[PDB]
């Protein structure tokens, strides 16, 4: 036992890398970035047929024009979306436009290696987060997505997965894409990667999906609208 | 210094609080202490452990403490550790007081203190106290009431109990001679007796080697008084005459 | 900073046993004895006192609190001084408030007091010492030990440190009662005699008294002459 | 006058192994009469009593601060508190607030718990204390009471004595004040027990 | 073990973490101060560990004051902080009692701030050791120096880093209570020169600075041309 | 071993594992290259890419009109001390209405960072970063480790297969002094290159490129605005 | 004040201080929830019974405020924190929005304050899991559950506590449309549920209906037989 | 029991199964690290401090190595044992004297400083986080009623006023030399102060010194000021006891 802003010899903090490996007992959830918008899919991951669907919310919105999936320690993401929340709204109160993806996607990140228990408040962060984030939305860039993990680090990706089974999807993923793909085609490929990936038998309840276009705002598909895109794969 | 630090407030693998768990057998070992509750009273009864014979005797008991007007506790466990937290019942009891005036129901004056005890398990990587109570009372709300709490935090109400030395053998005892709704201050008293001969099997037992408090209702009036010796004696005489028509 | 976690803890069977190793301490510490008499109370101890190089009155064991209350202790010398400190600060805080000098009894409820703190407090050991308390008030004696635990006891007399398991016997097959202060004193002497090794003289013995006058150390020369007798 | 926006007075007296305390009864906002049983005088012991006139809000104020005090101190203690130690908790608590005070000068009367030796004392609002071995007033009408005292008390009165006196002594102080009255409240401390009377009094 | 922490004495008295600072102080190259007639000298051997570096990079002599420098070995990280500590220590003593503080009491100051940081299991002690040095007519030249421990001497001529006792053993050749700076700071160099392993580690710059009569009771650095010559005479003695 | 796992404690050799650790954080990173001429401080940076279809973490960063970074390491430890310095920036002009000159910025990034190094439970800043800068003594390139101490350079490379990169620049830093800008970012390209496996290119995906000097603002240079530079690699 | 590190990650993303927590509900007597149509139910194994015990204060069934209550198994200390932490909490809420809390949002803000303290020095996880249950403004039922990790979901029915696997596999199988269809079937249902692990059934089951508008109604033992002989008598036939 | 050891009590203050604090034991052997003796004793009319100086190496400016320092203009004090806890051990008397001065407008006794440093030193015994100082104070002056004094203290936070003492390596050698010889003194005073203490230096080390390799300070009842001798005036009692 050591304490938790201890390196290994490799130069890595050892609790961001077991925050990392924690990333590996979630769902997984697919982003994918067109220029007609992105979307943002989730594996739900029912236990039981008792459970409420609909109360596992793992795509939120951020803002009327960013979406969010995350996948790890579900809990852990909760501050970290609000977050992301206030400092769109602050965005907006100060500047009187919207905030970028990036910038979101930025201000979050900063959050994620201040744990520590010598500097800081009587009782601050003991431990960095155990998840990963996919922010998905539009702004003056155009459609844009962006990928965050415990390490702070973040990066914008054509297309992603992350969880459980993201080695698999990422390999489907870099096979589908192509950079002049269509919104549908995209929300197509990552439910037929999803379908591939997931234990269970892929439906409209065990899953959600999200997109954002320069149309239009955030918007999570319904059950009758994910039945309609089901019906091809 | 981390290399330094015990851990005091963490789990076990099994989800366990080990201080608390060794708390609880600091109290085993000390002094038997039972409570009981009668239609017309509640008592406490505890086995000494100030018995040396060059003692001096200063304060009117050992370990019965008055808490408030209407409200009474003793102790077994750390006496320095129940020192602090009788102190600060007292002070609870005075803040509501203060703040409502009228006196602290009996089982919110409990759940405050518990409330501390828990505390001390969760955070702060401190020692827990070691220290379980009995709380007898009355309040307008339930009447007379007994309650017993322990190092975790946790309290209950009880028509009787024990806590400290042979707690177990004196809880049966209690669950088989115990009359659920028809005692009286006189025979819980007989019955207290009964119970402390039994588990004091180290050794003959005596007025110097017990306490013995009861709360009644007089006139409107909470009374909480300490026996004296005199009284006590003449129980154990009773109890022994009684024991004399056990067989014919 | 200052550690915050207790160094004191339960062990499995119960045991606090920082708060043992500090007996530990206070057994081997110097002899200290206290006796209540009818009219008075008296503490004596034995100084550990090596080389004709000491200057004996320098510094003292048998200490006042008030004009009515005085201590002794076995154990640790520096950690006695800080609980002297605090006494005193005690009974001056009470003084303050309440425009009457501090009942013993309550005096050693507060410093008994300060010793429960550092067996639980972070980053502290317990005291190594064990502390006699003697008093008049409400026209009565008092004598009282506080241990490192912080719990107190009133005693009629007792011994603490090196010994006292037979310095208790000793008094328990000599007390009344109804003794006079000056043959407790005499009584005092003689239990340290019981442990002693050297020869006593005034010098390595030390001496305090307590009755209705109030709380004060025996000079040089009172001792002198109680240990002609012995 | 702060001291004034309430009105009142309170005073207490020695006799002999007695003491006597007594109060008004009116609680008003300036002109306004709003009741006429408004309690002055409160037990601090069995045979230990404190009165206090001033600003109303601060009279319920230090009563209860002090008696939350006093419960701890008599819990801790052995003991019921001699009334030289109240009177120097009282002076604490009031110099505490030296620089914000309690608008309140109070009178404590009462028996020594173990002696039955009388003592009466008042205190400014900062916590001054002054003992004496006759009266002590306090209040809106304190030139009224003082007129009425120096010339009426006499050592060592007996119980009954003591009454009339004190009795008379509020009474006629408080009708030469437009904001004191609207009865009057006095108890008799003896050893063996405590005499509460109402006077008939003015109620203008 | 017993060697952990600087809140902890080993059993036979040793507080082994400043023990193994001051080793960080021995694998450092070596650095010198002489004290003599008119002033004060230092001469530092500065290993150049790239050619990728600038000249004068890694600096391990500093002005602390404007009469006062600082000459340092070990880890250079915590050397730098020190000399933040002695100028802010400079400043302050200035701003209260409003005239230059004397090198010994700005030495003593420093190594209680040293010392500091060898007692508690908080923070670790400084992988450090530094000289001090100055000159001004009322009290003349001062060279001290301090070390891990916060212990501060005051010398005529001092050493620290690996090659110290070689170092100290041709100092004590120059009677240097009769010697100026202008012929000490040759005698630096010579030094330097003599203690560096060339085999060893195979590049270094000769550092230089002195604080004197000559410099007005200003610390400053060795003007080139004369640090130039002084190289040339130490290249040339060594043959 | 009992030595390795607080930035507290000397080992016996007199060293601080915990500090050697964090540079290992630095060596890790993708390469980066800073060099100057007279008039000219450039930053050249490798860009890795997580998947095929992630574009490539930024390397370089703007401090000031006068000042930017390249980085190596532990990326949100580089965020933070970017954002000291910009801020240390900005107090400057703020205070004196002149550029913070760089070798005081890169003193208090110094002082900044040995302060954790020697505080129980705190650590170093896993990062090293190569600083471009030009003010009234001119063109700057510094550079920064978790050690706390810093270095006036020349010209510079660290990150993953640096040593190669130095090399490189070792071999013709004797041109450096007398180039013009184009030649100069030649020059940092091809060191750069010295870092790739064989088989591998210098792209308009993974190069990033940072220029300031006397005529010349703090500017980066990525993606299509690369392309000027990386033809007539000739 | 102390500030240590209580709960961190260990190799392969495990919080250890939380499985540990987990293992303290596991050990907590049983608890079980069903949502009905227009009732929820709360219903709870024992604890220890003791005839010496004064029920009135034990009992594991607590209102957090009007319409909503809650059920917890774990430590029953740990417990009593949260649960005076949410009644707090369900008074601000009218004090500021003038609505009563939404069960949802008492729900998120008791697993807040569990994720809370499994990421802030100096304190470990709470040892328990909660099952919480009301009804919303517009007459919605509800029935959620928190566990030490902070983690939340809505359920139909659940357990938590000792016994909850197997209780959970028979609520999948005994929760239908028929079963819910009346009051009386759904507190039969729950009785069901516990009978199976109920130690000397029971004799030890505590129980408690909320009803659309109508307040928290805990049974009485009287009550409590008289839904276990009409149950235990139409399991003969 | 007998050098038992559980836990951590041999790395930090808490205590050992005897009731032992073995991080203070070690503080007193931290104070021999150094190599070096002091010797000090009392007179009807002086008392004086003597210790060993030694300068090894040439190149030290031999006026800056000492021992000896003035707290106040009446108190003197010699340290033995770790350099840098001395000294920061120095500015904390200092401190204290100064600000006795400062409330209470009369200078700190020379007991109360002892006391008062003795007190602090305490707490480094009770509280886990830092070590004690590895070395022991020795303070001389002259009380207006009790004549010259004396007094130690130590890393435990004993203290005590003393006819003569030592402290370092030869410690307990010097203490046996001290008692022999005033128990042969009427009225068990030392009379030959500085005599004594030189000659108390010089047998236990075995040396017979030069002016330049020890230390002297005084303070008299005549001259209560704190004053160090010169190497002449220490040479000038060297050559009076070489004498006889
Ligand atoms: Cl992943
Ligand atoms: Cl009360
Ligand atoms: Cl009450
Ligand atoms: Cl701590
Ligand atoms: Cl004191
Ligand atoms: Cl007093
Ligand atoms: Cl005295
Ligand atoms: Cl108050
Ligand atoms: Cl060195
Ligand atoms: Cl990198
Ligand atoms: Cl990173
Ligand atoms: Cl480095
Ligand atoms: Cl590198
Ligand atoms: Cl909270
Ligand atoms: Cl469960
Ligand atoms: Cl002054
Ligand atoms: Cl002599
Ligand atoms: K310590
Ligand atoms: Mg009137
Ligand atoms: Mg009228």
């Not at chain 5, 000249?55 to 915590?78: I, T």
Request: hydrophobic share 40%.
């Amino acid at each position: 036992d050591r304490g938790v802003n201890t390196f290994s010899p490799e130069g890595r903090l050892f609790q961001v890398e077991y925050a990392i490996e924690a990333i590996k007992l979630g769902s997984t959830a697919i982003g994918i970035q067109t220029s007609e918008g992105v979307c943002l899919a989730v594996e739900k991951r029912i236990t039981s047929p008792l459970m409420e669907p609909s109360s596992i919310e793992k795509i939120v919105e951020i803002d009327a024009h960013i979406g969010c999936a995350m996948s790890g320690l579900i809990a852990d993401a909760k501050t970290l979306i609000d977050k992301a929340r206030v400092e769109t709204q602050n965005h907006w109160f100060t500047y009187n436009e919207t905030m970028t993806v990036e910038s979101v996607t930025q201000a979050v990140s900063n959050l994620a290696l201040q744990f520590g228990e010598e500097d800081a408040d009587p009782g601050a962060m003991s431990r960095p987060f155990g998840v990963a984030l996919l922010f998905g939305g539009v702004d003056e860039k155009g459609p844009q997505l962006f990928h965050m993990d415990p390490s702070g680090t973040f990066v914008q990706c054509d297309a992603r997965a992350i969880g459980s089974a993201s080695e698999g999807a990422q390999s489907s993923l870099q096979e589908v894409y192509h950079k002049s793909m269509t919104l549908k085609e995209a929300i197509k490929s990552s439910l037929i990667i999803l379908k591939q990936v997931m234990e269970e038998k892929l439906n409209a309840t065990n899953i959600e999906l999200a997109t954002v276009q320069p149309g239009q705002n955030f918007h999570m598909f319904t059950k009758e609208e994910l039945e309609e895109v089901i019906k091809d794969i | 210094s981390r290399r330094y630090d015990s851990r005091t407030t963490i789990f076990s693998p099994e989800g366990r609080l080990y201080q608390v768990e060794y708390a609880m057998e600091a109290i085993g070992h000390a002094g038997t202490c039972l409570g009981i509750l009668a239609n017309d009273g509640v008592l406490l009864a505890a086995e000494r452990r100030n018995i040396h014979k060059l003692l001096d005797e200063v304060f009117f008991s050992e370990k019965i403490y008055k808490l408030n007007e209407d409200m009474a506790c003793s102790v077994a466990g750390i006496t320095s550790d129940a020192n602090v937290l009788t102190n600060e019942l007292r002070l609870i009891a005075q803040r509501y007081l203060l703040q409502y005036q009228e006196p602290i129901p009996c089982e919110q004056l409990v759940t405050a203190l518990c409330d501390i005890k828990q505390a001390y398990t969760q955070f702060g990587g401190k020692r827990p106290f070691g220290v379980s109570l009995l709380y007898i009372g009355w309040d307008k709300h339930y009447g007379f009431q007994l309650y017993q709490s322990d190092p975790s935090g946790n309290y209950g109400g009880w028509k009787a109990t024990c806590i400290g030395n042979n707690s177990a053998a004196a809880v049966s005892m209690l669950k088989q001679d115990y009359k659920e709704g028809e005692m009286t201050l006189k025979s819980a008293l007989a019955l207290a007796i009964k119970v402390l001969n039994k588990t004091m099997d180290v050794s003959k037992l005596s007025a110097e080697k017990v306490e013995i408090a009861t709360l009644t209702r007089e006139n409107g009036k909470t009374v909480i008084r300490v026996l004296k010796q005199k009284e006590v004696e003449q129980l154990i005489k009773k109890h022994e005459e009684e024991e004399a028509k056990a067989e014919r | 900073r200052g550690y915050s976690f207790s160094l004191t803890t339960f062990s499995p069977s119960g045991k606090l046993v920082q708060i043992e190793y500090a007996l530990a301490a206070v057994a081997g510490g110097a002899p200290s004895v206290g006796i209540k008499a009818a009219n008075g109370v008296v503490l004596a101890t034995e100084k550990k006192q090596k080389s004709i190089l000491y200057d004996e009155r320098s510094v003292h064991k048998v200490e006042p609190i008030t004009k009515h209350i005085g201590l002794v202790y076995s154990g640790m010398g520096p950690d006695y001084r800080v609980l002297v400190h605090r006494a005193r600060k005690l009974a001056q805080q009470y003084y303050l408030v309440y425009q009457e000098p501090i009942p013993t009894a309550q005096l050693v409820q507060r410093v008994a007091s300060v010793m429960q703190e550092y067996t639980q407090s972070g980053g502290v050991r317990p005291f190594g010492v064990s502390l006699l308390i003697c008093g008049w008030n409400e026209g009565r004696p008092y004598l009282f030990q506080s241990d490192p635990s912080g719990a107190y006891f009133a005693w009629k007399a007792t011994a603490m440190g090196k010994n006292y398991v037979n310095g208790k016997t000793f008094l328990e097959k000599r007390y009344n009662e109804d003794l006079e202060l000056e043959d407790a004193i005499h009584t005092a002497i003689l239990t340290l005699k019981e442990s002693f090794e050297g020869q006593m003289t005034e010098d390595n013995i030390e001496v305090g008294i307590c009755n209705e006058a109030g709380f004060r150390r025996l000079t040089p020369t009172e001792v002198k002459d109680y240990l002609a007798a012995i | 006058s702060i001291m004034s926006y309430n009105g009142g007075a309170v005073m207490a007296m020695k006799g002999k192994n007695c003491v006597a305390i007594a109060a008004d009864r009116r609680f008003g906002i300036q002109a306004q009469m709003v009741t006429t049983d408004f309690q002055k005088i409160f037990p601090m012991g069995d045979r230990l009593y404190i009165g206090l006139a001033g600003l109303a809000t601060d009279v319920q104020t230090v009563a209860q601060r002090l008696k939350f005090r006093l419960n701890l101190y008599e819990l801790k203690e052995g003991r019921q508190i001699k009334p030289y130690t109240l009177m120097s908790m009282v002076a604490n608590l009031l110099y505490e607030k030296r620089f914000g005070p309690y608008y309140t000068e109070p009178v404590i009367a009462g028996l020594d718990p173990k002696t039955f030796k009388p003592f009466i004392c008042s205190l400014d609002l900062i916590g001054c204390p002054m003992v004496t071995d006759d009266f002590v007033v306090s209040g809106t009408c304190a030139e009224q009471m003082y007129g009425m005292c120096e010339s009426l008390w006499e050592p060592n009165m007996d119980p009954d004595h003591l009454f009339e006196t004190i009795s008379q002594a509020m009474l006629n102080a408080v009708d030469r004040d437009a904001v004191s009255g609207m009865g009057v409240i006095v108890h008799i401390i003896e050893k063996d027990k405590i005499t509460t009377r109402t006077l008939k009094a003015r109620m203008d | 073990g017993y060697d952990l922490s600087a809140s902890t004495f080993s059993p036979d008295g040793r507080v082994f973490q400043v023990e193994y600072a001051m080793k960080a102080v021995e694998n450092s190259s070596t650095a010198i101060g002489i004290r003599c007639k008119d002033g004060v000298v230092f001469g530092v051997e500065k290993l150049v560990l790239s050619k990728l570096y600038e000249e004068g990079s890694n600096k391990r002599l500093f002005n602390v004051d404007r009469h006062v420098g600082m000459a340092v070995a070990g880890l250079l990280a915590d050397a730098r902080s020190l000399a933040d500590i002695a100028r802010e220590e400079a400043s302050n003593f200035r701003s209260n009692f409003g005239y230059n503080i004397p090198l010994k009491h700005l030495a003593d100051r420093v190594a209680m701030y040293v010392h500091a940081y060898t007692l508690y299991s908080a923070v670790r002690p400084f992988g450090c050791s530094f000289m001090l040095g100055s000159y001004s007519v009322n009290d003349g030249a001062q060279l001290y120096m301090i070390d891990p421990s916060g212990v501060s001497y005051g010398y005529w001529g001092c050493a620290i880093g690996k090659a110290r006792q070689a170092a100290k053993t041709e100092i004590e050749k120059l009677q240097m209570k009769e010697m100026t700076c202008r012929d000490i700071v040759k005698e630096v160099a010579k030094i330097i020169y003599i203690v560096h392993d060339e085999v060893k580690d195979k590049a270094f710059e000769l550092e230089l600075s002195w604080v004197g009569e000559l410099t007005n009771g200003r610390h400053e650095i060795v003007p080139k041309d004369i640090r130039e010559e002084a190289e040339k005479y130490a290249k040339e003695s060594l043959k | 071993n009992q030595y390795d796992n607080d930035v507290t404690v000397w080992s016996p050799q007199g060293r601080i594992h915990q500090i050697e650790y964090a540079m290992e954080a630095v060596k890790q990173g993708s390469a980066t290259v800073g060099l100057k001429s007279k008039t000219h401080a450039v930053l050249v940076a490798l860009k890795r890419a997580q998947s095929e279809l992630a574009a490539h973490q930024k390397k370089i960063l703007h401090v000031d009109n006068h000042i930017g970074i390249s980085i190596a390491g532990l990326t949100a430890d580089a965020r933070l001390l970017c954002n000291f310095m910009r801020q240390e920036c900005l107090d400057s002009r703020f205070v004196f209405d002149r550029p913070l000159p760089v070798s005081r910025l890169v003193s208090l990034i110094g002082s900044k960072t040995q302060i954790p190094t020697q505080r129980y439970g705190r650590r170093p800043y896993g990062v090293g970063l190569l600083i471009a800068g030009y003010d009234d003594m001119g063109p700057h390139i510094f550079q920064t480790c978790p050690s706390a101490n810093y270095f006036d350079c020349r010209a510079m490379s660290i990150g993953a297969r640096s040593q190669s990169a130095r090399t490189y620049l070792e071999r013709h830093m004797s041109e450096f002094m007398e180039c013009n800008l184009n030649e100069l970012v030649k020059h940092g390209l091809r060191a750069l290159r010295e870092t790739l496996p064989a088989e591998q290119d210098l792209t308009t995906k993974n190069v990033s490129i940072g220029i300031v000097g006397k005529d010349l603002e703090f500017t980066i240079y990525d993606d299509d605005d690369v392309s000027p530079f990386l033809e007539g690699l000739e | 004040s102390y500030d240590r590190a209580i709960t961190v990650f260990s190799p392969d993303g495990h919080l250890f201080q939380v499985e540990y927590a987990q293992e303290a509900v596991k050990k907590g007597s049983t608890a079980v929830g069903v949502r009905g149509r227009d009732i929820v139910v709360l219903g709870v194994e024992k604890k220890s019974v003791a005839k010496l015990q004064d029920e009135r204060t034990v009992r594991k069934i607590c209102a957090l405020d009007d319409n909503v209550c809650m059920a917890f198994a774990g430590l029953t200390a740990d417990a009593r924190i949260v649960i005076n932490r949410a009644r707090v909490e369900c008074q601000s809420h009218r004090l500021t929005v003038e609505d009563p809390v939404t069960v949802e949002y008492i729900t998120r803000y008791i697993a807040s304050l569990k994720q809370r303290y499994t990421q802030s020095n100096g304190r470990r996880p709470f040892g328990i899991s909660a099952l919480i249950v009301g009804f919303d403004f517009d007459g919605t039922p509800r029935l959620y559950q928190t566990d030490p990790s902070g983690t939340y979901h809505a359920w139909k029915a659940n357990a938590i506590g000792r016994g909850a696997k197997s209780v959970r596999e028979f609520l999948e199988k005994n929760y239908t449309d028929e079963a819910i269809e009346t009051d009386d079937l759904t507190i039969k249902l729950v009785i069901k549920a516990l009978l199976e692990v109920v130690q000397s059934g029971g004799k030890n089951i505590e129980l408690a209906v909320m009803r659309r508008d109508q307040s928290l109604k805990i049974l009485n033992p009287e009550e409590i037989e008289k839904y276990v002989a009409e149950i235990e008598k139409e399991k003969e036939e | 029991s007998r050098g038992s050891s559980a836990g951590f009590d041999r790395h930090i203050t808490i205590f050992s199964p005897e009731g032992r604090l073995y991080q203070v034991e070690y503080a007193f052997k931290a104070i021999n690290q150094g190599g070096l003796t002091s010797v000090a004793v009392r007179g009807k009319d002086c008392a004086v401090i003597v210790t060993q100086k030694k300068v090894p190496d040439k190149l030290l400016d031999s006026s800056t190595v000492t021992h000896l320092f003035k707290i106040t203009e009446n108190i003197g004090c010699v340290m033995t044992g770790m350099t840098a806890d001395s000294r920061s051990q120095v500015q904390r008397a200092r401190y204290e004297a100064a600000n006795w001065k400062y409330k209470y407008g009369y200078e700190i006794p020379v007991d109360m400083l002892c006391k008062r440093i003795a007190d602090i030193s305490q707490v480094y015994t009770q509280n886990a986080e830092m070590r004690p100082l590895g070395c022991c104070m020795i303070l001389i002056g002259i009380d207006e009623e009790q004549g010259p004094q004396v007094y130690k203290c130590d890393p435990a936070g004993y203290y005590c006023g003393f006819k003569a003492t030592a402290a370092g390596v030869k410690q307990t050698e010097s203490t046996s030399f001290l008692e022999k010889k005033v128990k042969k003194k009427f009225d068990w005073t030392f009379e030959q102060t500085v005599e004594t203490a030189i000659t108390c230096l010089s047998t236990v080390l075995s040396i017979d010194f030069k002016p330049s390799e020890i230390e002297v300070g005084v303070v008299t009842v005549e001259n209560p000021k704190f004053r160090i001798l010169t190497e002449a005036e220490i040479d000038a009692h060297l050559v009076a006891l070489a004498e006889r």
